[PDB]
Amino acid sequence: RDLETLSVNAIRFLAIDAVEKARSGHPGMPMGMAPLAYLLFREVMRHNPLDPDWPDRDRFVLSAGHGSMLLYAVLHLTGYDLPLEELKSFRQWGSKTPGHPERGHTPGVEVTTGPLGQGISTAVGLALAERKLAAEFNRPGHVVVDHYTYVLASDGDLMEGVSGEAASLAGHWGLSKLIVFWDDNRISIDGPTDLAFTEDVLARYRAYGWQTLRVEDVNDLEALRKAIKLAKLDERPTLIAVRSHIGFGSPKQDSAKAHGEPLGPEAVEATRRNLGWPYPPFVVPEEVYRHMDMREKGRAWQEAWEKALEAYARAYPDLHQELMRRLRGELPPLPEEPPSFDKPIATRAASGRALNLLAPRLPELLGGSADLTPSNNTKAEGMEDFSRANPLGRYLHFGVREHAMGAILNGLNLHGGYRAYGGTFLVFSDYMRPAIRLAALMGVPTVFVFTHDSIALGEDGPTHQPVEHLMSLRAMPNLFVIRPADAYETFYAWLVALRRKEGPTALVLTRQAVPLLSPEKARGLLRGGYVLEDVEEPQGVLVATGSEVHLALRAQALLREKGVRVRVVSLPSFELFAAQPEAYRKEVLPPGLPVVAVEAGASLGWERYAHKVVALDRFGASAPYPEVYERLGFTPERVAEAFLSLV
Amino acid sequence: RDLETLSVNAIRFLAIDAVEKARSGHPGMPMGMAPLAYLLFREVMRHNPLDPDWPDRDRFVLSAGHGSMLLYAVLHLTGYDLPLEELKSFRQWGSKTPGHPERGHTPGVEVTTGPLGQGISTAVGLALAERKLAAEFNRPGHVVVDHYTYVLASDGDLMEGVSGEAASLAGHWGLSKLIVFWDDNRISIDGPTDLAFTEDVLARYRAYGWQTLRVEDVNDLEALRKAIKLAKLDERPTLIAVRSHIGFGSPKQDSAKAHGEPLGPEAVEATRRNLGWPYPPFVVPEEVYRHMDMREKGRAWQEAWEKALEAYARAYPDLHQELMRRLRGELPPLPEEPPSFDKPIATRAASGRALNLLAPRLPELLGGSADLTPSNNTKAEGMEDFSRANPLGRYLHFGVREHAMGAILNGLNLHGGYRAYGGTFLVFSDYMRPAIRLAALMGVPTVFVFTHDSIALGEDGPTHQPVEHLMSLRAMPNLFVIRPADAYETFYAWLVALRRKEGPTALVLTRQAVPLLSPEKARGLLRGGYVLEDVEEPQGVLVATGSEVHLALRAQALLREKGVRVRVVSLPSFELFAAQPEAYRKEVLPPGLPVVAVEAGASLGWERYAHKVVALDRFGASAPYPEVYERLGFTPERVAEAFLSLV
Numbered sequence A, B: 001r002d003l004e005t006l007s008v009n010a011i012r013f014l015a016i017d018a019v020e021k022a023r024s025g026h027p028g029m030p031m032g033m034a035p036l037a038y039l040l041f042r043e044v045m046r047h048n049p050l051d052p053d054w055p056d057r058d059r060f061v062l063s064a065g066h067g068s069m070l071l072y073a074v075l076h077l078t079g080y081d082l083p084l085e086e087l088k089s090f091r092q093w094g095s096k097t098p099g100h101p102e103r104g105h106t107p108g109v110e111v112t113t114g115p116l117g118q119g120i121s122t123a124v125g126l127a128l129a130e131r132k133l134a135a136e137f138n139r140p141g142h143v144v145v146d147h148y149t150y151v152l153a154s155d156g157d158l159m160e161g162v163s164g165e166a167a168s169l170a171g172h173w174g175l176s177k178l179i180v181f182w183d184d185n186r187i188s189i190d191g192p193t194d195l196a197f198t199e200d201v202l203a204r205y206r207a208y209g210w211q212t213l214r215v216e217d218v219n220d221l222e223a224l225r226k227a228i229k230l231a232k233l234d235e236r237p238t239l240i241a242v243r244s245h246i247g248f249g250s251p252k253q254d255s256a257k258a259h260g261e262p263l264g265p266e267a268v269e270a271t272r273r274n275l276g277w278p279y280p281p282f283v284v285p286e287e288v289y290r291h292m293d294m295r296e297k298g299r300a301w302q303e304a305w306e307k308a309l310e311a312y313a314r315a316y317p318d319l320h321q322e323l324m325r326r327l328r329g330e331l332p333p334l335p336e337e338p339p340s341f342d343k344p345i346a347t348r349a350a351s352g353r354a355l356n357l358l359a360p361r362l363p364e365l366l367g368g369s370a371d372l373t374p375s376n377n378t379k380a381e382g383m384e385d386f387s388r389a390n391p392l393g394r395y396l397h398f399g400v401r402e403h404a405m406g407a408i409l410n411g412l413n414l415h416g417g418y419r420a421y422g423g424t425f426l427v428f429s430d431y432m433r434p435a436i437r438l439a440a441l442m443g444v445p446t447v448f449v450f451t452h453d454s455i456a457l458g459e460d461g462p463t464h465q466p467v468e469h470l471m472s473l474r475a476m477p478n479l480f481v482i483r484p485a486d487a488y489e490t491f492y493a494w495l496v497a498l499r500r501k502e503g504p505t506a507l508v509l510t511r512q513a514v515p516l517l518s519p520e521k522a523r524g525l526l527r528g529g530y531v532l533e534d535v536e537e538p539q540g541v542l543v544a545t546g547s548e549v550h551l552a553l554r555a556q557a558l559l560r561e562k563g564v565r566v567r568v569v570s571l572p573s574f575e576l577f578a579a580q581p582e583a584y585r586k587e588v589l590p591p592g593l594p595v596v597a598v599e600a601g602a603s604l605g606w607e608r609y610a611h612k613v614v615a616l617d618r619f620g621a622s623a624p625y626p627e628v629y630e631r632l633g634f635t636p637e638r639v640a641e642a643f644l645s646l647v
Helices: A002-022 A028-044 A065-078 A118-137 A155-159 A161-172 A201-207 A221-233 A264-275 A286-292 A295-315 A317-327 A347-361 A402-415 A426-431 A433-442 A469-474 A487-499 A519-527 A548-561 A574-578 A582-588 A627-631 A636-644 B002-022 B028-044 B065-077 B118-137 B155-159 B161-173 B201-207 B221-233 B265-274 B286-292 B295-315 B317-328 B347-361 B402-415 B426-442 B469-474 B487-499 B521-527 B548-561 B574-578 B582-588 B627-631 B636-644
Strands: A059-062 A149-153 A178-184 A211-215 A238-243 A365-369 A395-397 A419-425 A447-451 A480-482 A505-508 A530-533 A540-544 A566-570 A595-598 A612-614 B059-062 B149-153 B178-184 B211-215 B238-243 B365-369 B395-397 B419-425 B447-451 B480-482 B505-508 B530-533 B540-544 B566-570 B595-598 B612-614
Touching: A002 A028, A002 A065, A002 A264, A002 A286, A028 A065, A028 A149, A028 A178, A028 A221, A028 A286, A059 A065, A059 A118, A065 A286, A118 A149, A118 A155, A118 A161, A118 A178, A118 A402, A118 A433, A155 A161, A155 A178, A161 A201, A161 A402, A161 B161, A178 A221, A201 A211, A201 A238, A201 B201, A211 A221, A221 A238, A295 A317, A347 A365, A347 A447, A347 A487, A365 A402, A402 A419, A402 A426, A402 A433, A419 A426, A426 A433, A426 A447, A426 A469, A426 B426, A433 B426, A469 A480, A469 B469, A480 A487, A480 A574, A487 A505, A487 A519, A519 A530, A519 A574, A530 A548, A530 A582, A540 A548, A540 A636, A548 A566, A548 A595, A548 A636, A574 A582, A595 A636, A612 A636, B002 B028, B002 B065, B002 B265, B002 B286, B028 B065, B028 B149, B028 B178, B028 B221, B028 B286, B059 B065, B059 B118, B065 B286, B118 B149, B118 B155, B118 B161, B118 B178, B118 B402, B118 B426, B155 B161, B155 B178, B161 B201, B161 B402, B178 B221, B201 B211, B201 B238, B211 B221, B221 B238, B295 B317, B347 B365, B347 B447, B347 B487, B365 B402, B402 B419, B402 B426, B419 B426, B426 B447, B426 B469, B426 B505, B469 B480, B480 B487, B480 B574, B487 B505, B487 B521, B521 B530, B521 B574, B530 B548, B540 B548, B540 B636, B548 B566, B548 B595, B548 B636, B574 B582, B595 B636, B612 B636
Parallel strands: A059 A149, A149 A178, A178 A238, A211 A238, A365 A395, A365 A419, A419 A447, A447 A505, A480 A505, A540 A566, A540 A595, A595 A612, B059 B149, B149 B178, B178 B238, B211 B238, B365 B395, B365 B419, B419 B447, B447 B505, B480 B505, B540 B566, B540 B595, B595 B612
Antiparallel strands: A530 A566, B530 B566
C-alpha cells in the first residue's frame, strides 16, 4: 500500500511539475486519474517498454488527450524511452511530450488524441482488428493474437456524437475485449458538467449493448481490479464509470480551475503538503523507479509471444508467413494489368471492378460503407459481411455513421494486420472530417472512397452535390486526393492509394457512367498529372480532373475544328503531380502557354495551374444528368469559349 | 374510415406515380408513412396552407428527406400552392419538387433536409426558440406563442451522432413540445437494418430524458392520435416508434428494393390492385380534395392569432412592438463606434468586448459555446445561462457537441424572433461541417464564432491548430469568412455578420494578443479588403489576413530599411472583397506589381491574389507562441525575403 501510494503520487507530481514548468497544460485530470494509470501500466496490461510496437501488447488509448502528462508520467516511470528531460520539456518545441498525445512521435502513444470522441471511437477499430485477427489466425493450442483495448475517456468524449456512433457499433459487433474507463468527475470547462450534461450515461451504454460498471472511488485500487476482471469475463464491451476528484489533493480540487491551467506555486506547495510528498520537482525516489520498471516483464511477455510464434510456424507454415507479412505491413506484389473494360462505366463501378481484382490477392484488405454499399461499389467479389456470427467477414456495414466509420477505419489501419477502406458520397465526407484529419496527422494510410462526386449525380439535388469538397480536402496536409477520369485511371488510382503509406488517400468517383481512356494513357495517373492528348506546337492547355477530362477532350475537338491547337492534361491528383520533379511538371504544363481548367467544383485554388477555369461556385440543383450538368455550365462549347477568350 | 383510407391512399399513389414518372426517387417510405402525414396535416397540426409563414403554425420537419414525395403530396392535397403539375415535375430542373426538401423553394417546407440527422437535430433549435419566445413574450391572458415541433425521422437519422447530441440536449432542456416520429420499418439501404443497427433505441432516448412511446401499426390512426395526445401531456420531449412496412401494399414491401428506386410498371399495377386504387396516375377524386382542403381552417386559425395579437398590442404596446420587429427580422439601431481599446488584445477578447456593446441593444441575440465559454468569449456581459429553470437565459451551454450546436443554431435562426451565434475552436468547425453547409444552402444567417485560429494558439498543438480550415470554408458557396486583423476590425466584422441576412458568417478569431490598428482604418473591413498602410510609388504589395496583417506591417518596415517600398493590404474577407466593384479591387491591388501573401494556413487558393505566398502547408506543433509561430516560418525576415525574390 506504501509503494502503490508512493508510485501513484509520483505520477501525480510528475504531472503537476511538468505543467508548472511549462506554465501550460492540464494538471487536474492526471491528478485524479493517476491511480488508474498506475494500475493499467503496472498490473493489468501486458506491454513492453523496450518495444512499443510488440504486436500482441494490450493497447491503451488516452481519448481525453488533454491529460497527456498522465500518460507521459506512466510511460517514463515504467521504462519507455521517455527521459525525465523530455518531461521537463512538456509542450516545448520539438519535445517528445507535446500538449496532446501524438502517435508516432512519442514511444507508447497508440493514438493521436485531443479532439474529443476520436480516441474512444478509434479504439473500436483497434478492438475490431484484434478480434478479427484472432479469428483468422488463432488455432487449437496456438493463440498468437490475444490482447485487450483499454481507453480512458472524459465527459466530453461521451458527449460527442462520434463516440455514440462507435459505441453502437461496438455493442452490435460484440467487442468483448474493449474496456473503457470514464472519468466521472462532474467537471467541465464551462463549470459543473450538469450545465449541459445530465443524461443517464450508463443506461445509454446498456442500450448500445454494453456492460456497465461503477467504481465509486478511483483511489480504491481493489475496486478497480475487481471491475476489470468482471469486464474481461463479459462478452460485451464494457464502460466503467470511475468516480474521481479533478485536482485531487489540491486547493483547486473539484473545480474547473484545476482543468487546463498550471496549479500555481501556492496550490503546488499545498498539494505537496496535503498528499505528503517531500520530493522536489521531477524527483522520484529510486524505490518507485524499481517498482515501476517493466522492462523485464516486457521482455518476458514478448519473448513468450515470440516462442509461441515459433510453435505456430511449425504447425502452420503458410499461416505464420502471412501473419508475419501482414504484421510488418508488407504488401504482396500488386497486379500491373488493369481489368478489362469494354464500354462506358462509372468510376465507382470501375472501382468495384478494381477491387474484385485486388481483394482476392490482399487478405488484409477490409472494406465497408456507411449504408451505401450498393451505391459505393465497395463490397468486393469474395467478401462476406463481418458480424458476431461471422467474425471472418471482410466487409463492414457501418450503418449511417460516417464519422465513426472514419475513426474505426483509422483504428483498423493502426492496429497492424489490416488495410481498410470505407465508402460514402463525397458530400458526406463532411460528416467525418475529424477522422480524415486525424489519419493525416497520424500518418495512417486509411483509404476513403467517395462516390457521387459532382452535380452529375443528378436528381438527389444540392444537399447531395459536392462543390467545395474537392478543394477543401486538397488544402489538408498529408492527404492524397485522386479523382480518376475513367475506368483505367481508377485502377491506377487504387495502386497509388495502396502503395502510399505516409498518409490517407481520398478516391473520388462518379455516379454517372463516363467514357474509357486507353489503358496505356491512363497509366499516366501514376505521375499525378500528364498529357492525355497532345498536339503539334500547342497554343494552349485544357487541364481537367475526373469526369471533366472527357469534357475537355470534346472542347479540344471543337477547338481543333477552328484551327486552334490545345493539348489536354488529366490531373487526377494535385499532390502526386506536385511531388514530381519541376522539369516534368513544366513538360506537362509549359510556362507561357495559356491554360484553362475544367472541374465541376469550386474554382478557389485553380489559379495555381490555370489562367481561367470552368468551375462551379454555387450549390447544385435537383435535375437529371446530363441536363443538370449542361445547364449548370459544363458543355464543350463553354470550355472552348473560355479558351478562345485567352487567345 | 372510407374517406380516411381513400385520402391516405391518395398520398401513397401521388408519391408512387410521381417517382414513377420521374424514374427517380424514393417511394417506399412515403407508402408506409402515408397515414401519419395524413393525420398530421388533416387533424393534428395547426397551419395555414394560405400562409406557410404564419409564425404560430405548428412546425413539421421531414428529417428523412428522401421521402420528399410524402410531403409534397400532402402539401398538395391540403391546399398549399403546389399544383399537380409540380408533382408531375418531381426531380426535374426548376421544379418546386426537388428530390429532397428545400426551404424557400417549396411552400410548406420548414427545413432543407436530405443529409440524415440534420432535420431532427435542427428541430431541437426550432422547439428551443418556441419555448424561449413563449417565456419571453407570453403574458397572463395573452398567449401569443404556442406551437409544436413535429419531426418524421428514419433509422438513419437515429444512427447519426448529431441526432444523439441534439436529443441529449433536448431532454436536458426539457423541450416538452418536441414530438418525434420514428419510422421503424427495419429496412436500410444495405438491406435488413439489423445488418448494423440493433441497439435499443427507445432505451437510449429514455436515458436522454425523453418519453418514449410505441405505435404497433402506422395504419392504426386511433393509436397514432393516442400517442400524440400522450406526448402533448408529457413534460419531456417524446420519441414515438411507429412500425410500418416500407413499400406497404406492393410486391416490394419490406424490401430494400422499395427504398430508392421507382416501383416499376408491374409493381405499380400490383399495388393499385392490392390496395384497391382504381384512379389513374396523378388523379385524385374530388371527395378527397374536398375532405383534405385545409384552407378554410387554416385562415381561421391564423385569424384567431391575429386577434390575440391585436389584443396583445393593446395590453402590451412595447412588448408587441419588439415582437413584431423581431419576427420581421429587422435589426434595431446599433452602436456605430467600436469599443475603446488601449493595449494589445486577442481578437477573441475583442469579440467579447464587441458583444458586451452589441448584446444590450439586441434582446433577440442568443449566444453559446460547445464547452469553451471561457476560451471563446461568447458570453456577453448581461447574458444569463438558459436552463429549464431559467428559460429567459440568452446564453447556451451546448456542451462538447459542435455538430448539434450547429444544427440547433440553425433551428433558432430559422424559427423567427432570434439571431443566434455559437463558438468553438476553428479546428473544430470540422465537427459541424454539415450544419455549416446546411445554413449556406438554406440562406440562414447563423453566425459561427471560431477562435484559436492558427498555430499561434501555441502549446495545445497540431490537433488543435488549423491549417486547411480557412480555405476549406472559403470554397463553400454562401459563407462569409471574416478574419479580423485586430480588435477594431473585429467590431466591424460583427456588424457585417449581423447585417448579412443572406447566409451564414464565420468569424475567425485569435487566441494570442495582437497589436491594435488605427480605429478609423479598421473600418476598411467593410470593403472586405483595403489598403492598410500605403507608401508612395509602391514597388509591390503584401496582402494578409487576421494576425498576419501585423507581420506584414513588420515586413513592410524591414523592407523600408533596405529601401524597398511596399504597401500593406488587409483582406479580412475574400467574399466581401470579391463583391466590390472591379475598379476598387484593382485600386487595392494594382495590376502589374508583385504581391506576396501572408496567412498562417494552407497556400492553396492564394494564387488568386498573390504571386508568392508565405503560408503553412504542414500541420503545426506543440510549442509556445511566438516561438511556434516564428519557427514555423512566420517572421518579417521570411516575408521580406519572399518579396525580395520578386523585385
